[PDB]
Design a protein around this motif. Structure first.
Motif, PDB file in Angstrom:
ATOM      1  N   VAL A 195       0.723  -1.618  -0.131  1.00 47.00           N
ATOM      2  CA  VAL A 195      -0.275  -0.243   0.114  1.00 47.00           C
ATOM      3  C   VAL A 195       0.839   1.191   0.017  1.00 47.00           C
ATOM      4  O   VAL A 195       1.309   2.320   1.166  1.00 47.00           O
ATOM      5  CB  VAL A 195      -0.769  -0.409   1.123  1.00 47.00           C
ATOM      6  N   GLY A 196       0.722   1.774  -1.227  1.00 41.51           N
ATOM      7  CA  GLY A 196       1.603   3.707  -1.391  1.00 41.51           C
ATOM      8  C   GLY A 196       0.626   3.956  -1.253  1.00 41.51           C
ATOM      9  O   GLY A 196      -0.636   4.433  -1.532  1.00 41.51           O
ATOM     10  N   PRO A 235     -11.299   8.342  -4.431  1.00 45.41           N
ATOM     11  CA  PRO A 235     -12.115   7.690  -5.032  1.00 45.41           C
ATOM     12  C   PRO A 235     -12.091   6.366  -5.623  1.00 45.41           C
ATOM     13  O   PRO A 235     -11.376   5.962  -5.087  1.00 45.41           O
ATOM     14  CB  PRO A 235     -11.618   8.558  -6.420  1.00 45.41           C
ATOM     15  N   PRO A 236     -12.993   6.035  -6.515  1.00 45.01           N
ATOM     16  CA  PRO A 236     -12.304   4.361  -7.029  1.00 45.01           C
ATOM     17  C   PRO A 236     -10.836   3.848  -7.309  1.00 45.01           C
ATOM     18  O   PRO A 236     -10.178   4.457  -8.210  1.00 45.01           O
ATOM     19  CB  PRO A 236     -13.581   4.646  -8.313  1.00 45.01           C
ATOM     20  N   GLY A 237     -10.411   3.034  -6.613  1.00 41.73           N
ATOM     21  CA  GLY A 237      -9.415   2.161  -6.976  1.00 41.73           C
ATOM     22  C   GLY A 237      -8.375   3.121  -6.865  1.00 41.73           C
ATOM     23  O   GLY A 237      -6.764   2.627  -6.799  1.00 41.73           O
ATOM     24  N   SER A 238      -8.592   3.966  -4.856  1.00 47.48           N
ATOM     25  CA  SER A 238      -7.681   4.587  -4.542  1.00 47.48           C
ATOM     26  C   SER A 238      -6.734   3.696  -3.312  1.00 47.48           C
ATOM     27  O   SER A 238      -6.751   3.769  -2.749  1.00 47.48           O
ATOM     28  CB  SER A 238      -8.303   6.032  -3.557  1.00 47.48           C
ATOM     29  N   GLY A 239      -7.725   2.483  -3.275  1.00 43.32           N
ATOM     30  CA  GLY A 239      -6.641   0.751  -1.743  1.00 43.32           C
ATOM     31  C   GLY A 239      -7.908   0.809  -0.950  1.00 43.32           C
ATOM     32  O   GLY A 239      -7.003   0.889   0.091  1.00 43.32           O
ATOM     33  N   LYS A 240      -9.186   1.084  -1.149  1.00 38.83           N
ATOM     34  CA  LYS A 240      -9.856   1.046   0.483  1.00 38.83           C
ATOM     35  C   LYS A 240      -9.888  -0.661   0.721  1.00 38.83           C
ATOM     36  O   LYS A 240      -9.068  -0.938   2.114  1.00 38.83           O
ATOM     37  CB  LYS A 240     -11.071   1.906  -0.225  1.00 38.83           C
ATOM     38  N   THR A 241     -10.079  -0.883  -0.359  1.00 38.51           N
ATOM     39  CA  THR A 241     -10.603  -2.562  -0.191  1.00 38.51           C
ATOM     40  C   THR A 241      -9.204  -3.154   0.039  1.00 38.51           C
ATOM     41  O   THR A 241      -8.897  -3.866   1.383  1.00 38.51           O
ATOM     42  CB  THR A 241     -10.587  -3.383  -1.554  1.00 38.51           C
ATOM     43  N   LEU A 242      -7.688  -2.645  -0.137  1.00 35.12           N
ATOM     44  CA  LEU A 242      -6.764  -3.162  -0.498  1.00 35.12           C
ATOM     45  C   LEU A 242      -5.675  -2.917   1.527  1.00 35.12           C
ATOM     46  O   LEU A 242      -6.028  -3.524   1.879  1.00 35.12           O
ATOM     47  CB  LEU A 242      -5.711  -2.121  -0.975  1.00 35.12           C
ATOM     48  N   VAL A 369       3.840   3.594  -5.633  1.00 36.41           N
ATOM     49  CA  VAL A 369       2.201   3.089  -6.102  1.00 36.41           C
ATOM     50  C   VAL A 369       3.259   2.159  -7.301  1.00 36.41           C
ATOM     51  O   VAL A 369       2.683   0.446  -7.401  1.00 36.41           O
ATOM     52  CB  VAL A 369       1.549   3.608  -6.154  1.00 36.41           C
ATOM     53  N   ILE A 372       5.276  -0.193  -6.215  1.00 35.29           N
ATOM     54  CA  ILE A 372       4.603  -2.453  -5.356  1.00 35.29           C
ATOM     55  C   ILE A 372       4.565  -2.817  -6.978  1.00 35.29           C
ATOM     56  O   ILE A 372       4.502  -4.022  -6.758  1.00 35.29           O
ATOM     57  CB  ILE A 372       3.899  -1.562  -4.887  1.00 35.29           C
ATOM     58  N   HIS A 373       4.107  -2.250  -8.096  1.00 37.28           N
ATOM     59  CA  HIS A 373       3.272  -3.090  -9.192  1.00 37.28           C
ATOM     60  C   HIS A 373       4.887  -2.978 -10.746  1.00 37.28           C
ATOM     61  O   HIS A 373       4.573  -3.473 -11.785  1.00 37.28           O
ATOM     62  CB  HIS A 373       3.021  -2.158  -9.920  1.00 37.28           C
ATOM     63  N   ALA A 398      -5.118   2.040  -8.280  1.00 38.50           N
ATOM     64  CA  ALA A 398      -5.418   1.756  -9.681  1.00 38.50           C
ATOM     65  C   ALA A 398      -4.868   2.242 -11.069  1.00 38.50           C
ATOM     66  O   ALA A 398      -4.639   0.759 -11.957  1.00 38.50           O
ATOM     67  CB  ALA A 398      -7.376   1.463  -9.706  1.00 38.50           C
ATOM     68  N   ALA A 401      -1.607   1.111 -11.151  1.00 35.98           N
ATOM     69  CA  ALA A 401      -1.680  -0.328 -11.099  1.00 35.98           C
ATOM     70  C   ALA A 401      -1.440  -0.898 -12.922  1.00 35.98           C
ATOM     71  O   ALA A 401      -1.198  -1.670 -12.845  1.00 35.98           O
ATOM     72  CB  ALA A 401      -2.246  -0.819 -10.289  1.00 35.98           C
TER      73      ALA A 401
HETATM   74  N1  LIG Z   1      -2.319   2.873  -2.391  1.00 39.25           N
HETATM   75  C1  LIG Z   1      -1.804   1.518  -3.714  1.00 39.25           C
HETATM   76  N2  LIG Z   1      -1.193   1.149  -3.607  1.00 39.25           N
HETATM   77  C2  LIG Z   1      -0.875   0.420  -4.240  1.00 39.25           C
HETATM   78  N3  LIG Z   1      -1.636  -0.422  -5.739  1.00 39.25           N
HETATM   79  C3  LIG Z   1      -2.809  -0.079  -5.115  1.00 39.25           C
HETATM   80  C4  LIG Z   1      -3.573   1.334  -4.189  1.00 39.25           C
HETATM   81  N4  LIG Z   1      -3.820   1.850  -4.568  1.00 39.25           N
HETATM   82  C5  LIG Z   1      -5.231   0.710  -5.419  1.00 39.25           C
HETATM   83  N5  LIG Z   1      -4.044   0.037  -6.096  1.00 39.25           N
HETATM   84  C6  LIG Z   1      -4.064  -1.209  -6.540  1.00 39.25           C
HETATM   85  O1  LIG Z   1      -5.262  -1.149  -7.079  1.00 39.25           O
HETATM   86  C7  LIG Z   1      -6.213  -1.812  -6.741  1.00 39.25           C
HETATM   87  C8  LIG Z   1      -7.603  -0.430  -7.031  1.00 39.25           C
HETATM   88  O2  LIG Z   1      -8.530  -1.796  -6.216  1.00 39.25           O
HETATM   89  P1  LIG Z   1      -9.245  -1.224  -4.108  1.00 39.25           P
HETATM   90  O3  LIG Z   1      -8.050  -1.598  -3.715  1.00 39.25           O
HETATM   91  O4  LIG Z   1     -10.209  -1.762  -4.265  1.00 39.25           O
HETATM   92  O5  LIG Z   1      -9.340   0.263  -4.597  1.00 39.25           O
HETATM   93  P2  LIG Z   1     -10.866   1.380  -4.245  1.00 39.25           P
HETATM   94  O6  LIG Z   1     -11.491  -0.051  -2.775  1.00 39.25           O
HETATM   95  O7  LIG Z   1     -10.245   2.212  -2.897  1.00 39.25           O
HETATM   96  O8  LIG Z   1     -11.907   1.412  -4.912  1.00 39.25           O
HETATM   97  C9  LIG Z   1      -5.822  -2.400  -5.735  1.00 39.25           C
HETATM   98  O9  LIG Z   1      -6.131  -3.564  -5.921  1.00 39.25           O
HETATM   99  C10 LIG Z   1      -4.647  -2.262  -6.289  1.00 39.25           C
HETATM  100  O10 LIG Z   1      -3.767  -3.340  -6.868  1.00 39.25           O
END
Ligand SMILES: Nc1ncnc2c1ncn2[C@@H]1O[C@H](COP(=O)(O)OP(=O)(O)O)[C@@H](O)[C@H]1O
Ligand SMILES: Nc1ncnc2c1ncn2[C@@H]1O[C@H](COP(=O)(O)OP(=O)(O)O)[C@@H](O)[C@H]1O
Lengths: 450, 79, 450
Positions: A195-196, A235-242, A369, A372-373, A398, A401
């Motif tokens: 997580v970055g 916002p979507p893809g900002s790593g909340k689930t991560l 970020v 990481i990828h 995202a 990524a």
């Molecule tokens: N802060 C971050 N650092 C590294 N990778 C990230 C980050 N945010 C998103 N990603 C990558 O992109 C994907 C975005 O999905 P997600 O975590 O569900 O975002 P969100 O829940 O905020 O909508 C993650 O699975 C991860 O692989």
């Protein structure tokens, strides 16, 4: 008394707290130079660390002025090889009987080598051990990165027995059927190192969750009730689930994931039954983290609720949060990209008390970020991840990524013609160029005001 | 009320905290005490494991613990 | 030829470019260690630097790996003492004849000592020279900070003549009527060192303005027409006026300030006559910077214009911008806290081509701002400017500047009882405490979404 003197002397400078590693190396642990002076250990020396579940490993000890005096810096591989987690206590012991290896038998784990072909030695183990003089202990599991993936290997045997240093004269044996995973989680599982761009936000979450989830019996003695609910914004893809998966994995907490649309796709009554059962399972398997993704699908504002059974679900969530006790050892994490669409009753004391805003990453955060990828990717010298972060303004986690995965595919197509099906030693050799990242930038789909 | 079961330092000034916490409700102030209490537990106690009563009763919450709790808080009246 | 060989050898490693100083010291210049090796100068050595207008000074040369090889780091005092500006070229020369001072006569400048009383030696010069071994050259002017202000002093005489190092055996003479300012700008004038929290934005502005304003004759040979208009965006008190004055002072550009309300307060026809005359004066005294403050007062959107003569002023501004040529060497800087209220016709190519967003400063940026407004203040060890920046989230430059002035007054009232009227040696001794900053924080009047 005898045994009382043993237990009370467990405040020896040989007992240190597990902290994160700055440099990700499976064989290196970092200590403070005053701590190594107290413990009479020199830089480069191999030390024996004993952890939990009567497990132990051998690492290279290194001096770090940034490392705290009562702490120890170690990566996720070393941590797992000791059956410990960040915050736990291990004991460092002198290791003077580390003879060079005569022969080591190393085999990969099946779930990491699915679809992989060719000799794993030339692709992974050979550049891994090369002039590194790595301490190796039998039963250990390590991670090697390269060729668009990461392979987990197990140390089957060592000569001399139990532990040895893998030198250039050490024979490395890696032939036979891959080993099957047993009572150990995947080393590729998401951790804080994945997580970055959210340094401050991560530290905040960690402070709130680590004490209730790592030391749950501690609040039985103290009359202080800790937080239950945390709202992650961004916002979507900002790593909340991560962040949620990272926190759960790093704490050893049971992870139950509630998904907004998943609940709302069910019939009337089935959605609330599922919602209850989710909270019930978390209490049973506690310490736990309930992650409610797209929390605005369930529980939106009373104005935005244009349904009778929909308002019944918002109310079900509020009472489940109220009915949850501190003594249950369950932390609920909600996530939404629309904080203003969420019902204000969730922000009440006893429900979602704390709120963390995970915005868009800055130049520095984007570079993190990008690192990481590109972990499992071979990069050219022509690649400048600092320049990509300078250009990718307004990109979330995202977006960055996806840019790496696209530049990775652009490299697969451009370099490899007709194979059929690729084998590991060829995948590990192909490098992603600045031209592949430029082509990926040209086909991308990614704002902040006062 | 929420410092009744807490040992406070002489460096603590609850009069000054009330002067600063303008726009705070009862819960906001109750949360500030519990946060300053946890900040005191972490800062004073290292590795125990689990704490016993005679040691908990001796640790005092300082003005620094209340300042740290104030820095991380989430708390208006017009005619 | 003889004189041709002199002029073409002006590419000697002794000819360096004037760059900013990391450490603000009136006696220290920083050079790259490879440059000092080329020039055979050792760290701590006193060097003679010759600038423009047949002016020169003596400084302590210091090694800095961050300093560029063809550049030299020097503060605003050294810069002025050489009649140069950032980007200009000076020549560094060996200075082996720097004998310790027998006696130096130093006097302050009247415009800096207005209202000041008591002995200036004990308050300023004594702690300034103390064990510092400062090189001093006759005719020089320096700045000393302390006692809620800064005093500018002139070096009237030195023994031995022209230059000497002020040692503990050097007699410092500072009695007599203050000297009157002559052909030299104030050392307390706003510079790049006075603008904090806008590192990236400052570099952007500097790149756009430095070439057209420092080398105006350069674009006569090149067929490239540079920018004319720049729009600065940001909330009130974020330093838009400050950045403009800083840029004008640092470039030597003529500064004409147009004020939105000042223009709009005038009669019908008088406002446009003033608007024309402002542009005319800037062209006459060019290289110039026209600063239009509160640009939204003049030139708002055509919807927000509820006046006939008001629309005549918006149109007057657009044509003045269009009528301005690159050959005029005038850069127009507009400032507004309402970018969306500004007429979109200003953003057109030929008018305000570039836009810089100066947002709210982050923790790091706030600490920088706090350092700037505590320069002339004595601070206690109990003061933690890092902690104040951690707390003052959502504060702009002015909010932080006001917090310092309030903590300064809180210190004046709390420490000083009945004097009448304070003298310099007592003002320089009173320290602003953490209690004064806490009291100022309690009475303050200071948001960012995706
Ligand atoms: N802060 C971050 N650092 C590294 N990778 C990230 C980050 N945010 C998103 N990603 C990558 O992109 C994907 C975005 O999905 P997600 O975590 O569900 O975002 P969100 O829940 O905020 O909508 C993650 O699975 C991860 O692989
Ligand atoms: N970035 C900053 N760094 C240091 N001081 C600042 C900064 N921004 C504002 N200040 C201080 O506060 C005052 C705010 O006024 P001003 O420059 O006119 O702001 P703006 O034009 O953005 O409304 C300045 O005169 C200066 O003393």
């Amino acid at each position: 008394d005898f045994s009382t003197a043993i237990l009370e002397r467990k405040k020896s400078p040989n007992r240190l707290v597990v902290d994160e590693a700055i440099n990700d190396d499976n064989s290196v642990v970092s200590l403070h130079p005053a701590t190594m002076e107290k413990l009479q250990l020199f830089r480069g020396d191999t030390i024996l660390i004993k952890g939990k579940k009567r497990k132990d490993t051998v690492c290279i000890a290194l001096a770090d002025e940034t490392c705290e005096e009562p702490k120890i810096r170690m990566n996720k591989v070393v941590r797992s090889n000791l059956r410990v987690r960040l915050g736990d206590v291990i004991s460092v012991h002198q290791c003077p009987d580390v003879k060079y290896g005569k022969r080591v038998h190393i085999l990969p784990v099946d779930d990491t080598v699915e679809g992989v072909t060719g000799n794993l030695f030339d692709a992974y183990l050979k550049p891994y051990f090369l002039e590194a003089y790595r301490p190796v202990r039998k039963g250990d599991l390590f991670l090697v990165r390269g060729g668009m993936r990461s392979v987990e290997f197990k140390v089957i045997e060592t000569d001399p027995a139990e532990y040895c240093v893998v030198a250039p004269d050490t024979e490395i044996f890696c032939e036979g059927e891959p080993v099957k995973r047993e009572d150990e989680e995947r080393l590729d599982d998401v951790g804080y190192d994945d997580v970055g761009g959210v340094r401050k936000q991560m530290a905040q979450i960690r402070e709130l969750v680590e004490l209730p989830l790592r030391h749950p019996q501690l609040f039985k003695s103290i009359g202080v009730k800790p937080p239950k609910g945390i709202l992650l914004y961004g916002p979507p893809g900002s790593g909340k689930t991560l962040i949620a998966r990272a926190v759960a994995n790093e704490t050893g907490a049971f992870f139950f994931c509630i998904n907004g649309p998943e609940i709302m796709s069910k019939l009337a009554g089935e959605s609330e039954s599922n919602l209850r059962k989710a909270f019930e399972e978390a209490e049973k398997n506690a310490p736990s983290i309930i992650f409610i993704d797209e929390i605005d699908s369930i529980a939106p504002k009373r104005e935005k609720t244009n349904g009778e059974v929909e308002r019944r679900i918002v109310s079900q969530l509020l009472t489940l949060m109220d009915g949850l006790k501190s003594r249950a050892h369950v932390i609920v994490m909600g996530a939404t990209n629309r904080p203003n669409s969420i019902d204000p009753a969730l922000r009440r004391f006893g429900r979602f008390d704390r709120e963390i805003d995970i915005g868009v990453p800055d130049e520095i955060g984007r570079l993190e970020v990008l690192r990481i990828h590109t972990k499992n990717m071979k990069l050219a010298e022509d690649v400048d991840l600092e320049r990509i972060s300078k250009d990718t303004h307004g990109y979330v986690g995202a977006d960055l990524a996806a840019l790496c995965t696209e530049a990775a595919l652009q490299c697969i197509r451009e370099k490899m013609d007709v194979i059929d099906s690729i084998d590991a030693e060829i995948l590990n050799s192909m490098a992603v160029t600045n031209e592949h990242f430029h082509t990926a930038l040209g086909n991308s789909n990614p704002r902040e005001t006062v």
